[PDB]
Ligand binder design. Structure first.
Ligand code: NI
Length: 341
């Protein structure tokens, strides 16, 4: 049974609610993005209308095989009528294809569902500038002040400079980057661009990247691993054993691996600057954990919410414990008293 925070009151709509069977009263199922916790339940046998971005729709058709007649792609930044209700999709600054959804209810209430997002000051000049929001369904993944991390631009600067130095010192080093979902593609694209290389990967991952409308993608990626000195591997293989095993397969072309594990936040963020990050090393293998986030930091979240001034907040993450729910409600009230709404 579908929880309350995935239903949109006054509508036949749900958000990210595919794992509950047929939801009673649902006439349109929205999907904010192609991450498995959110699409859980969708398959080629699904027979109700799915509303989403174009990129999400490419992935539903090619990777999950949902049939075309049930896929309803909408453009961004454009007023659309769905089943008698005006909606707008906005870029969520999460992974490729990820959206926020603005719903203009028939009674005059305006609802913003963030999906998963990384808040940014540029969102203060979208279609959100123009009108009031009564209810905010908020991605609260990092809603506590201990969650700090650098900008994505600082993190990419660190990765490009680390990879360029290592391969200029040793032209026989291979670079490997871990992945387990869409998102964070700038990590491996920026490193391969500084090295003058295409990125090599499996046929399954190439297929996924081919759905993402990345400009000039055919110039940037390949399934010919031998031609490439940046390889993608599943995240589970980014350890000393998996990397040894991979270097054997490369036929004596390389004598060193430098590897990257993009994570979200880790507790080593509470002590270390990005500049000061060091790897784990065994022999001719080094592994860097880099804090590349596609979710809001505490401070980015608080800025967004203090600007929007919603009348009510419904969290969508960390909702399963009383202590998490109480902690989040406290910070919502501080923010509201501090800014005066
Ligand atoms: Ni996500």
């Amino acid at each position: 049974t579908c929880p309350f925070y995935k239903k949109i009151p006054g509508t036949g709509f749900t958000v990210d609610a595919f794992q509950y069977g047929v939801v009673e009263g649902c006439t349109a199922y929205f999907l904010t993005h192609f991450h498995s916790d959110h699409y859980a339940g969708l398959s080629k046998h699904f027979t109700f209308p799915v509303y989403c971005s174009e990129i999400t729709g490419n992935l539903l058709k090619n990777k999950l095989h949902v049939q075309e007649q049930y896929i309803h792609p909408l453009p961004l930044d454009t007023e659309c009528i769905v089943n008698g209700v005006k909606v707008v999709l906005l870029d969520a600054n999460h992974c490729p294809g990820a959206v926020m959804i603005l719903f203009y209810l028939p009674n005059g209430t305006v609802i913003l569902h963030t999906g998963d997002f990384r808040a940014d000051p540029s969102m203060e000049r979208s279609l959100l500038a123009d009108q009031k929001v009564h209810m905010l369904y908020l991605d609260t993944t990092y809603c506590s002040p201990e969650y700090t991390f650098p900008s994505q631009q600082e993190v990419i600067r660190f990765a490009i400079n680390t990879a360029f130095e290592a391969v200029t010192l040793n032209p026989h080093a291979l670079v490997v980057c871990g992945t387990y979902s869409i998102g964070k593609e700038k990590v491996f694209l920026a490193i391969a661009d500084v090295l003058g290389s295409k990125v090599g990967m499996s046929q399954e991952k190439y297929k996924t990247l081919q759905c993402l409308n990345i400009p000039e993608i055919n110039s940037l990626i390949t399934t010919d691993m031998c031609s490439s000195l940046v390889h993608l591997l599943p995240m589970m293989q980014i350890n000393f054993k998996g990397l040894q095993s991979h270097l054997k397969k490369c036929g004596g072309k390389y004598n060193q691996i430098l590897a990257f594990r993009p994570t979200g936040w880790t507790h080593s963020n509470k002590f270390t600057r990005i500049a000061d990050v060091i790897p784990q090393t065994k022999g001719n293998i080094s592994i860097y954990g880099i804090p590349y986030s596609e979710h809001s930091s505490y401070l980015e979240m608080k800025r967004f919410v203090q600007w929007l001034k919603p009348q009510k907040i419904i969290p969508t993450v960390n909702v399963g414990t009383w202590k998490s729910r109480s902690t989040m409600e406290k910070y919502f009230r501080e923010w509201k008293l501090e800014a005066g709404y």
